Amino acid sequence: KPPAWYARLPLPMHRDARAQQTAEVVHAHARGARLTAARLGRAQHQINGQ
Amino acid sequence: MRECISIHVGQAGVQIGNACWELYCLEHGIQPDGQMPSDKTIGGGDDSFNTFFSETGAGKHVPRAVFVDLEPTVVDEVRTGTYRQLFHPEQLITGKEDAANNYARGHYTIGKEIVDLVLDRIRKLADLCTGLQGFLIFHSFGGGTGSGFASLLMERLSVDYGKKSKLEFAIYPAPQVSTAVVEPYNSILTTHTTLEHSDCAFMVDNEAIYDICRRNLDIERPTYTNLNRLIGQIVSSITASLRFDGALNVDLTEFQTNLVPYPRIHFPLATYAPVISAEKAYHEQLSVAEITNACFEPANQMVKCDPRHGKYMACCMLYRGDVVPKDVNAAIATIKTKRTIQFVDWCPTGFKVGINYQPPTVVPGGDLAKVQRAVCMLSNTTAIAEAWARLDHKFDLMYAKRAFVHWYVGEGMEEGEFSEAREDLAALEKDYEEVGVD
Amino acid sequence: MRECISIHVGQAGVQIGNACWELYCLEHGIQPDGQMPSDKTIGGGDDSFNTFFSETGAGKHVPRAVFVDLEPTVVDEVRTGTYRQLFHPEQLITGKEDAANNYARGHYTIGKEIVDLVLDRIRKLADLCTGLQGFLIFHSFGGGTGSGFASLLMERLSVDYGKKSKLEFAIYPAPQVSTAVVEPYNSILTTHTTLEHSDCAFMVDNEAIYDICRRNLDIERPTYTNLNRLIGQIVSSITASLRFDGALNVDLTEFQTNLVPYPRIHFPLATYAPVISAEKAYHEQLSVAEITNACFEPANQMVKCDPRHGKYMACCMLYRGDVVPKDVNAAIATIKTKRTIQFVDWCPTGFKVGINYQPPTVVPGGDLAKVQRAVCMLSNTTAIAEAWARLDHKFDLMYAKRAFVHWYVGEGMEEGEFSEAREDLAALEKDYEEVGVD
Amino acid sequence: PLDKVLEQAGRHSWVDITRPPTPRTQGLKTPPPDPIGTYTPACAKALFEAKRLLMES
Amino acid sequence: TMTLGLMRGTIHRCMKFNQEMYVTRGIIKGPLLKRNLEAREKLNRPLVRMYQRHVGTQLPEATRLAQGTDLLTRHNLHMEKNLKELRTTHDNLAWGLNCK
Amino acid sequence: IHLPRFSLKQGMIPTRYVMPWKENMKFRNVNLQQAEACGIYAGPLEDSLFWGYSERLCHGED
């Protein structure tokens, strides 16, 4: 298995690779959003509780 | 809306479409004039015909297909025939030269001046289309000429249309009959040029077609009339879900989704169970159990690939006519209880049913019986590893003795491409090996 | 009222006007006698013809044109043919000698002694007319005698009237076919004269007219009769706005204000979509979408240039027949959003639309079809630069080797103007490419 | 599923405002107060004021 | 004569070095069919915009796209320039052969 | 004087764009606040990322 994946430049199939490179960056923010949503929601919860 | 387009390349690929449109025109009341009876069904092209005929204001059903070829003989013949007034005037594109079976010749020497015109035709059809689910490409792997043009035009329509489905039917190499010496070469070229763009490919072995013919249609001298009529009925079955209604309806998108497990390997097989004649039908009975067993019979397949040598993973049953889910599911349960059938541990279930109430059709001068319950068995199985093994251990010999290559090098290609093709085939075969491993 | 005045010059440009009137008579029912039927259309001369004919008290239609030519042959033929009563006798002015393709001989030896007569004629028509929006000039850049004579005529018109626009047409130099070697010379002279006094100049080429004829009209052996019939249909379409009415109306003043963006470059190209053979139109379909696709299709344009290399500036289009704004806007939106069609950021939009209800009319015995949706397309593009790119590189060689310079100096001109002609042309190319650069 | 997300987030004693911040329960701490991330200071203030008010509660 | 035979192999390799990169242009410049393009979740994917939401900076995908297209165009130009020289040199050698 | 400055011409960018962070009406005042908080941009009262089949930089028309 001779490695060759270093830099070159031609990209015959590149659209989908970049599209999925958008996937982790779109997900991470949703994860952070659900974290902070959790903390604020529980705060509201026992606030209304008392 | 719901419509597709038909592409026919190669004088192999012409009479097949000829018989196909014969069946189509028979079934949708289409006459050799091109105009219906005095019944009111003419308009802007919005009814059952709307999927393959654009019967515009001229009242003439205009088929949504294109016939191309490189030699004028067959196309001028079908111009002299009976259906030419139906066929669109210049939807018949013809060159004046052959390709010497040379895929490289038909892809590089001559293809550079016909692809433009055919692209113009394709766009002027797709614009009047509205839904454009897909194309139906008919070429031949062992094509005397239909190799290089099929490859190149398929590539270019891929790079201009990036999402829609592609259905490609081919005649496979005959494993024990060679009517063309460089056929394995053309086959390997087509494979490693098309797999990365081809969407859904079906093969078929005409030797096994004839074997079926003289097994149960008990004629010792069948002909291309018969050989084309059978596959025409097959395609009628596959587009029945669009033509008529049913309890449940399936589409080519569902076909590709649930029929291909992984990328790359996308080569299923077909079978028509009720291939039976007038007298056997007339004094023998029909029902779900025997039609199912007949379609899963190990020998009635049109490709030499013994299931016991292979292994199954996917099955699409298509029942056309009157039929009931009760015995449908009962019979599929019986087949699962059968132990000879082998479904890999990957798939506990791989079965998709599709029901149409409308029964299929006979044709005047037909060779078929009067069918009521019909089934397409469309299955994907691992049984085609031997198919590529036989052709690779054929091809390696001719390359190690480098016979006939002077023709190709003279027309203007080179050999590193053959090297890449050979290693690609090796990779595919080993992939078959690991997927066979459970 | 909404009238113009026409001038034809050259045994190049006289038969084209002949065909023009052969077309223009029917749609007013102008019998070759020249007199209207028992229908009460005659009077002071007020009806649709009022823009071309002065049907004055004699009850006869008199065209508002003048034919100026230097050789009695063809003019005497046509005035001895059938339409002699229809034409005004001394509106036909004829000399006895030629310029033998020499611009300068015809511009200095013969021009001085017929210009008085022709100016007298144009004044005597200008007095009797009332509005006189403009003129219809026909000559040829390959002018064997029309070229220099018409250049001088156009100079005198520019200096006598300065209060209206002028329309110039030209059967253009064939880029790779050359019937004359004096062609580069007289073409360069006529161009670098016209550019600064030609108001709106149009070019067409006849090789591509042949190509159209045997691509879609399919006629393998046409003639000038067919070629000029096509050109006459074109000009009839462009002036149908003046001729009849419609939902919205357009005028040549709007043509100028909406086609030319800036000074100089005012050289669009025309195209006509629905040219087709009888049976083709008979059993195929026509509508706005496909006719627009065909009109923008690169190869239908009768001047050899590649829009794919080019980039568009503006686009006027005239729809003649029966049409509605809904389909209009839908189709034009799709074409705007098309990808291959490159539009410059300096134009957000570039589309000037025209609708008129009167279908075009075919000449009896004609060759086109009975169309109900005609369209003429007038586009400005950067694709025109190729012609000059070829012409300059022909001229520099043949003029640095300076053959025929003896011929030209033998009557009084020499190479000064030959230098400034190529230099004005060079200014032309540089400005074209500069404005093409965004 | 808020309930399952918060429990599988690691830290069990979320402080819940009321409950004392158990020094070892804090595992995954929030990203820093920044205007672009999911930790804008508008909530950073609010959690504090709510916490102290609930302290007097 | 032997060199003339040598030439054609490089000719074939170089000529093949153009078709696939035109293909690459086509496959990086979308379909040139807006009308069916959206089935691949048109660039600005609904999920992507709804991600944007509050926005605060966006995707660099257009920048990388233009970068790749530009590189493809540059190498296109270089290869075409060398190509145009090739045939003229070849046929001058051929005419020399004929004279000899 | 400032002038507009876009990128080159493409075929994949749509003619229009919305900017939901400036097109949401309910959370308007709060997002106005964090606009300055991040210090990214308000600038002209009128801009669009996708004017027509092309795009420009973050700094709106300046």
Ligand SMILES: Nc1nc2c(ncn2[C@@H]2O[C@H](COP(=O)(O)OP(=O)(O)OP(=O)(O)O)[C@@H](O)[C@H]2O)c(=O)[nH]1
């Ligand atoms: N599709 C189709 N194939 C056929 C038919 N009859 C025979 N064949 C097989 O199809 C193959 C035809 O390939 P070719 O003869 O090369 O056809 P081609 O490449 O289009 O060009 P030609 O050689 O000029 O005909 C043969 O090997 C036959 O075995 C038929 O009627 N229809």
Ligand SMILES: Nc1nc2c(ncn2[C@@H]2O[C@H](COP(=O)(O)OP(=O)(O)OP(=O)(O)O)[C@@H](O)[C@H]2O)c(=O)[nH]1
């Ligand atoms: N305008 C026009 N041009 C034509 C026609 N037919 C051919 N042509 C081309 O137009 C050119 C005619 O120009 P010239 O030959 O210089 O005509 P001229 O200047 O009036 O004088 P001559 O030298 O006697 O013909 C020819 O080269 C033809 O190629 C036609 O019917 N109308």
